Design a protein around this ligand. Structure first.
Ligand SMILES: Cc1cc(CCCOc2c(C)cc(-c3noc(C(F)(F)F)n3)cc2C)on1
Ligand SMILES: Cc1cc(CCCOc2c(C)cc(-c3noc(C(F)(F)F)n3)cc2C)on1
Ligand SMILES: Cc1cc(CCCOc2c(C)cc(-c3noc(C(F)(F)F)n3)cc2C)on1
Lengths: 29, 252, 285, 238, 238, 285, 285, 60, 29, 29, 29, 29
């Protein structure tokens, strides 16, 4: 499941596994 | 008073003036089979007050060397009035129970019995390879089994109380419905258990659902040892129902 | 907001443990620390009742202690061997009577409950040992033969056609095979223990062998005879999914002896058979 | 087709992964679920039930029910010690209890522990006992005075046969290792005579005490692992 | 491209998987479907049709139509037994019936069975017979009295030549194994003389009875498997 | 709510079996248990009519007994052998006249109906046996030659160009090849049985061979001659999809002898040719 | 507009550096260039305060200098060797006490902070050296044994069943194995340094060995003994994800000696032990 | 299934890639984060602090 | 192309190839 | 087919096969 | 990029590459 | 994340990695 966002240039920011440790590098700031 | 109890089942009433509450196994009170969980399509027979009443088993003597006693249900009630007849004339049976263990001594006696009701107590044999407990050993009837007495036949089950006759440690039996009869506090234990099984009804002859195990964890001591201190068990079926009637099964 | 439900799943904060509240000195005739173990109930006293506690905000969660988590990890349940020694026709196939009783690790966990109902995920790990130097092109066939179906007696038995049984063909060099199985019992739950027989005579069988017939797993090297001999060992792993368990019980204290039975061995000095370590005396930590 | 990039890890078999896979028995409909009493949903339900501690597990006792009882009796010296054990949930006298066995399938633990004691003498036997918990950073107490400076309960035996001592979670870190590892060694539980064991004439001059253990509302275990309280040294056969 | 993680199982061939695959004949348009009488959509439609039980399949009868008939005649002793078979759908005298053959392609069965009997004597031959079903947990009945204590139908032969006895589903578990496996062995069907076989003078002193079997509305089969009622021991050639 | 339709598909509860209702003692002159089998109709009596039943809520489903499920599993229909012994040019290619009659397991299931219409899913399992130690780089070509198209007579025949026929090229070490085929008959359904001839003389052919011509499957090892000899066995599996079947029939009772014919062998003691087991007598269970 | 947030992520312009503004000649008694280093604060003077600057629009960004970026790259942390020399049973398995102290490159970066909290991504690179000519079919098992779990002592120890531990099975020829691990400490952050002991006596251990117990990594060649010997070297790579770091410190100036300790070696001419290069004199650039 | 085209680079291991991967300890819940003084978020914070120059680093 | 349906629990029932013979097992009833 | 949900952070909770036994680990509580 | 169409049975007719020569067989008529 | 556009012939113009250097050939003009 992931966070679709709109403006139109959607940013489907998917997280494929059910654990937080599984996602890639963190956003900064 | 929180230390008195009157239990009425059918035409029997049992009392105790020194109880330690009552335990309702797994928190479920016995109830009849519902049509959503049922599977055998014929209409069940429900003897009601003629089978759901207290049946008192043979008494046992507790002495300073006793190692324990065990009974298996419904087997222990096989020669008991209408309930016993019903379990042999029918293929299937289903029932809950009120188990009341009685043992009184005096205020100058000490001792402790751990009274436990175990679902599916599959006994073990010790140092005998893959040979399992034989049918007649696990079907002692109302006389039960006195731990530490039997003449070593091959299919004789384990008699190690500290390993629960099944390869697990005694101190952990408390995870099953249980009570203690600590002579200084109470003189009876009362456990009410529902029907527990993975099928809604079952053969009363080939399958024993519960096992009543009584182990003296603290030795009986007093300064008047000649006075015999017996242990008596009274069991009352609850919501007994049978199905699949036919001729009477004759065993062994 | 189920989405909120999803966020809790991702962080593993579905089941939270309660906080410790602040308590104070007390002087009363309600004594929570006192009770009667004879009742068969555990005393319900908490730390706030015995000591004076501060307020602490618990963050711990119990997700990992769920029955789904405890039984939801693949463990080995069998190691199948097809060792080509001197006769390809006789050694290139075998069979196994399915059960979860041969490997102590997973057997013990499941046996902490009396009944358990679950779906299964089976993963297979095949490894081909080149005994003479080459493995060639190894293709394996694992066939599930439910009770009653014909069991193959030769590497070319007609039963390998698998007209109705489920077979998984694996080719060396491809990912490990895996498939799911639904809850298979004829009852509502699997019996981890069974105090019953299949008859009422001195020769009737006792135990789970009466109720847990799962069929046979027949397997063979599909490839025909090769010059170089190989030894193929296939390890089967099982994991429970969508689990429910009933009536917890004491963990196995002694080693297992055989499948479907609680039988055990006892030596002359029993303290070696259990994990209990002898204490020097009551006061030696 | 859709251009894809196969990532590291593809094709491997992690025993703890969580994927979906095709079903070997399509169209199959499982047996309807009936109600069975006693359902467990979380192992915490088992950690909250008391089980006996084989506290008197000396070599001559292992293999007997007496490994579960501590003997009390009229003392001739004051403030004598009755027993002493480590408080660590998976440490030795308590490793084989139910909570100790479950804790042995996890790497970390946290929360408060509840120790209960039931006196089994006659109804005419009296006794006052001091049960103490000594937080870490010090050796086990050598006297009742040293012990009572820590957390403690003075138990007076009477109509209610059982008492409970709560070992509060007092730690530097939020969790501790379940296995015997110094840094996260939780302290000790010791028991001493507060007064004496008095009995009238013609009454047994000794009596037993049973010890139980379970976890409080804040008890919690973490990081599943295999246990070292059970093993397999040969094939389990048919 | 899109990062992907190849999961275990990828690349394997499971005979019961349910995937899609490219079509070898693109653009091809299949012949229009015409209406054909007799369409079957579920095998249950075949289990609900009566077929004869080779009940008299003794060795001297196999290979003859007489393996399908049971002979009745004037008896000199009362309450004699006529036949006895196991009720298990895939057990022996009934394994080769249509419902038995279909049941042999599945591992589990449930539901009630319907046994029918058609009398084939003359229109002047009379007879009353007791057909009984003995639930499990007991041996097969040894007398008419023992048998009639179970489920039964007293059949009076007359203008309507056929009678039906329903073997209700009476089981512990919701299903049973189709293959001969004790635990899930369903009982027996026995037939006895209720009165006698009476005929007037100049009439055949013996008559046959045909036996049929099919499934009731609650009959159901589960878990597909290969059959052991047919085999191949060599190549089937052109 | 088709979505509701989808949920039923996932749980396999599309076709439910009816409940057993409660019945009571009766005394009437309507006797359901009585009937006449002569009519050719099955008596429609249910358990509630003969015994006194309780109310039971049936949960069983018939999804798995559907014709789609019964015929929808891959079974072996052929085992192709390319065995390189002493002449690569002659042994590296072969051909097979397509049919579903050579393997008893699936042939018997299909033959429980008179006509059947379905699409096919073909999966191939090739295995290369290294007879001399190496397999090199094996590439196979399986070509479908519909009736009439030219059949290759050498490993380099121009027909292997496959200008219009469908060919599947498989390379050793890649997943098993698989493809679908639409319903191929010139009629509306496939004939499982055919009581007809292709002429009206004593030499006309009888049976399904008259109607079930499916063409030929030609295959070859694409790789040219290698030093080491290999034996490639390709097993073909078939599964029916989107199935319809008409006029059910009795299952095959004796072994099959040949393709496209119901011919059988009978020995001197016939009870050995059928699955019927001799009973000791009418009263011996 | 988070989407705006996404665009900045793609171009790596999340953290911008400030512009240089135009400044002018000044004559005042506010002297920014003057200060007192004794205060422990850095003088906050900028170029506009000392010289006359022009206006320049800074485009530089600091994204790459983030702690996430600095510690977020896979570095080798261990090289495991399974060298089959003369006894398969003894040499086909091994174990390693997990830590991030054995490889100087990544150890030094992490040690630039006192505490750090992060999730880990582990990637393994196995390589099989054919010492005798063939590798056969190599299948490896890497098992994580948390502190307390049983450690295998033979290649067939029951602990390899992995009933509860996490194991990764890798098959030669498939992508490199990789998995993630959550922050594992019993504290809120990992200690990169620890000025403490595990006791209060002269024999108590000092340092991070007291706090950083991570367990053991047990691995084995799953394949059984093959004729040809192989040497399998598995290199483990670690990368920190979702990182936080506290209290920065001076970088390691001398070589590391041992794990979990700041101990170092010093030779007779110390300038060879540090990266400082001897200057000829104060005025020789 | 969905037709896919495996692109160059597939299967490789780039030490600086940024992918996701399955978690070896499912259901595990990390220790709650407490406040610790001195957090660093960007190395620029360290470049802005004065440190001494070993300017007189002659051999003696 | 495929038949998206809504209630929210969408059932994207995809058919990846352009021939009817290519799809999987049929729906029952 | 799967259960799309919205708040915007959609949780496309997909089930790729047509059998319930095929899905991954169950939700807790 | 591709031509989604609705009636609900969407026909996501995808073209994965940026050249017309890359797509599959043409529609007829 | 990517730029969905509509007219209906959507052009899902996806960029699979988080760096600008990762995308394919540039648009012209
Ligand atoms: C109690 C209890 C619970 C269970 C379910 C165990 C699952 O067991 C299996 C296993 C382990 C393997 C196969 C199997 N292995 O391979 C195949 C196939 F691929 F050939 F289908 N089926 C089938 C079952 C039922 O068994 N006893
Ligand atoms: C009755 C009846 C029904 C059927 C359809 C059988 C499907 O038969 C096949 C098989 C099994 C294989 C091929 C085949 N094998 O490989 C190839 C290709 F890949 F070369 F196209 N086609 C073609 C058909 C028509 O045949 N008889
Ligand atoms: C300080 C500090 C921070 C960390 C975390 C290091 C991550 O360490 C590992 C490594 C490198 C490998 C494994 C590991 N390697 O393989 C396996 C598995 F696949 F077997 F699970 N686990 C496990 C941990 C905890 O360790 N010390």
């Amino acid at each position: 499941g992931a966070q679709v966002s709109r403006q139109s240039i959607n940013y489907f920011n998917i997280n494929y596994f059910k654990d937080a440790a599984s996602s890639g590098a963190s956003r900064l700031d | 008073s929180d230390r008195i109890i009157q239990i009425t089942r059918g035409d029997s009433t049992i009392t105790s003036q020194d109880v330690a509450n009552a335990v309702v196994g797994y928190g479920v009170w016995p109830h009849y089979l519902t049509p959503q969980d049922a599977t055998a399509i014929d209409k069940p027979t429900q003897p009601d007050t003629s089978s759901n009443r207290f049946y008192t088993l043979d008494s046992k003597m507790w002495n300073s060397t006793s190692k324990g006693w065990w009974w298996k249900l419904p087997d222990a009630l096989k020669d008991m009035g209408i309930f016993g007849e019903n379990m042999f004339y029918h293929f299937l049976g289903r029932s809950g129970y009120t188990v009341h263990v009685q043992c009184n001594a005096s205020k100058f006696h000490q001792g402790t019995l751990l009274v436990v009701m175990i679902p599916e107590h599959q006994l073990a044999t010790v140092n005998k390879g893959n040979v399992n407990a034989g049918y007649k050993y696990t079907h002692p009837g109302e006389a039960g089994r006195e731990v530490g007495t039997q003449v070593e036949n091959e299919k004789q089950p384990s008699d190690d109380n500290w390993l629960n006759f099944d390869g697990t440690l005694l101190g952990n039996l408390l995870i099953f419905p249980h009570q203690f009869i600590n002579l200084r506090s109470n003189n009876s234990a009362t456990l009410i258990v529902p029907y527990v099984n993975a099928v809604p009804m079952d053969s009363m002859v080939r399958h024993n659902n519960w096992s009543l195990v009584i182990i003296p964890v603290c030795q009986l001591q007093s300064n008047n040892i000649s006075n015999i201190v017996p242990i008596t068990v009274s069991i009352s079926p609850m919501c007994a129902e049978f199905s699949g009637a036919r001729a009477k099964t004759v065993v062994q | 907001n189920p989405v909120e439900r999803y966020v809790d799943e991702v962080l593993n904060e579905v089941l939270v443990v309660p906080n410790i509240n602040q308590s104070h000195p007390t002087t009363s005739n309600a004594a929570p620390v006192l009770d009667a173990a004879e009742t068969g109930h555990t005393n319900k006293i908490q730390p706030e009742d015995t000591i004076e506690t501060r307020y602490v905000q618990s963050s711990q969660t119990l997700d990992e202690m769920s029955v789904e988590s405890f039984l939801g990890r693949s463990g080995c349940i069998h190691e199948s061997v097809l060792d080509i020694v001197d006769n390809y026709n006789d050694q290139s196939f075998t069979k196994w009577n399915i059960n979860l009783q041969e490997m102590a690790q997973i057997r013990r966990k499941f046996e902490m409950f009396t009944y358990a109902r679950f779906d299964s995920e089976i993963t297979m790990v095949p490894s081909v040992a080149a005994k003479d130097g080459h493995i060639g092109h190894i293709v394996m066939q694992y066939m599930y033969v439910p009770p009653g179906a014909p069991i193959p007696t030769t590497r070319d038995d007609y039963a390998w056609q698998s007209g109705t049984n489920a077979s998984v063909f694996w080719q060396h060099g491809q990912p490990f095979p895996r498939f799911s199985l639904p809850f298979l019992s004829i009852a509502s739950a699997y019996y981890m223990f069974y105090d019953g027989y299949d008859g009422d005579t001195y020769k009737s069988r006792y135990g789970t062998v009466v109720t847990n017939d799962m069929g046979t797993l027949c397997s063979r090297i599909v490839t025909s005879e090769q010059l170089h001999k190989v030894k193929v060992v296939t390890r089967i792993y099982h994991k429970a999914k969508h689990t429910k368990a009933w009536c917890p019980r004491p963990p196995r204290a002694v080693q297992y002896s055989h499948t479907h039975t609680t039988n055990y061995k006892l030596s002359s000095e029993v303290h070696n058979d259990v994990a209990i370590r002898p204490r020097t005396n009551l006061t030696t930590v | 087709g859709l251009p894809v990039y196969v990532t590291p890890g593809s094709g491997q078999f992690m025993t703890t992964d969580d994927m979906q896979s095709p079903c070997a028995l399509p169209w199959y409909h499982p047996t309807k679920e009936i109600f069975i009493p006693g359902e467990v949903k979380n192992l915490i339900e088992m950690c909250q039930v008391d089980t006996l501690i084989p506290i008197n597990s000396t070599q001559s006792n292992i293999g007997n029910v007496s490994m579960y009882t501590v003997t009390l009796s009229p003392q001739t010296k004051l403030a004598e010690e009755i027993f002493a054990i480590k408080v660590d949930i998976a440490s030795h006298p308590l490793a084989t209890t139910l909570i100790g066995e479950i804790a042995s399938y996890f790497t970390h633990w946290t929360g408060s522990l509840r120790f209960s004691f039931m006196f089994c003498g006659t109804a005419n036997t009296t006794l006052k006992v001091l049960l103490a918990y000594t937080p870490p950073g010090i050796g086990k107490p050598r006297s009742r005075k040293e012990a009572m400076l820590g957390t403690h309960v003075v138990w007076d035996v009477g109509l209610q046969s059982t008492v409970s001592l709560v070992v509060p979670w007092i730690s530097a870190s939020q969790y501790r290792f379940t296995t015997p590892d110094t840094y996260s060694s939780a302290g000790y539980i010791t028991c001493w005579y507060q007064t004496n064991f008095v009995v009238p004439p013609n009454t047994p001059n000794t009596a037993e005490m049973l010890c139980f253990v379970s976890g409080c509302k804040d008890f919690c275990l973490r990081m599943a692992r295999d246990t070292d309280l059970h093993k397999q040294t040969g094939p389990i056969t048919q």
